[PDB]
Amino acid sequence: CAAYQCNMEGCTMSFSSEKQLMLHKRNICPIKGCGKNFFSHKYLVQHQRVHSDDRPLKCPWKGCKMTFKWAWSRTEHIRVHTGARPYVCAEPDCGQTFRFVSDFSRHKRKTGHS
Ligand SMILES: [Zn+2]
Ligand SMILES: [Zn+2]
Ligand SMILES: [Zn+2]
Numbered sequence: 001c002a003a004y005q006c007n008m009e010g011c012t013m014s015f016s017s018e019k020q021l022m023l024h025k026r027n028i029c030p031i032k033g034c035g036k037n038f039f040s041h042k043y044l045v046q047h048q049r050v051h052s053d054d055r056p057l058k059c060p061w062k063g064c065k066m067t068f069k070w071a072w073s074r075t076e077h078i079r080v081h082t083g084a085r086p087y088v089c090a091e092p093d094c095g096q097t098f099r100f101v102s103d104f105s106r107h108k109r110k111t112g113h114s
């Protein structure tokens with residue numbers, strides 16, 4: 001089509017004109033009114049995702065209006081609705097359960113438990 005695609009390895013961005021593609025190749029932010037410049041294309045791509053508030057993945061639980069960027073975040077969230085606590089501590093006199101793996105990992109660090 002009329003769009004100008006970026007040819008940098010891994011990049012999926014496209015632009016209305018060659019002008020904006022050239023500015024993109026100079027690692028200038030694509031967002032109107034930002035103007036920030038970056039040392040590499042890696043730094044540029046990391047930055048522009050901060051401007052995004054797009055959360056494409058909706059919670060499937062009826063009544064819930066929450067939305068998510070990543071599938072793992074949505075999957076973890078659904079456990080709040082189901083009450084699932086998949087991670088159980090292995091120590092003899094603890095028996096503590098966790099909803100998210102990061103909470104289970106935090107418990108193993110803070111207290112010396114299996
Ligand atoms: Zn690019
Ligand atoms: Zn920016
Ligand atoms: Zn939900």
Ligand SMILES: [Zn+2]
Pocket residue numbers: 089090091094095096107111113
């Ligand atoms: Zn424990």
